[PDB]
């Protein structure tokens, strides 16, 4: 896991990434068990997230500012992020 801080410049400018629903493959004593998850689907060209080189397409979003997204909907998680947009920190599980 990596904690990624995303800075915000314009009040009207987005942090520069899209999120989507996905499937997380996770490990349990039984074996690999699928679970719903939230992922970065793409980055805005020229945007803030891109420019950092810290977020990648298909990184899995694990937490928004310390709060796990497990069990939340895509809209709920979107609302968490934008609320926190001035000081957004996301814990990701990198695709690489």
């Amino acid at each position: 896991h990596r904690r990624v801080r995303l800075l915000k410049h314009g009040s009207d400018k987005p942090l520069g990434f899209y999120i989507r629903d996905g499937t997380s493959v996770r490990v349990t004593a039984s074996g690999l068990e699928k679970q719903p998850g939230i992922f970065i689907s793409r980055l805005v060209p020229g945007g803030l997230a891109e420019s950092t080189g810290l977020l990648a397409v298909n990184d899995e979003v694990i937490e928004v500012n310390g709060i796990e997204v497990a069990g939340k909907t895509l809209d709920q998680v979107t609302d968490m992020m934008v609320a926190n947009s001035s000081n957004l920190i996301i814990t990701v599980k990198p695709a690489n």
Binding site: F17, L74, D75, T78, V82
Partner: peptide, 7 residues
Amino acid sequence: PPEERLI
């Protein structure tokens, strides 16, 4: 609902 959300 929409399948992608801009942040």
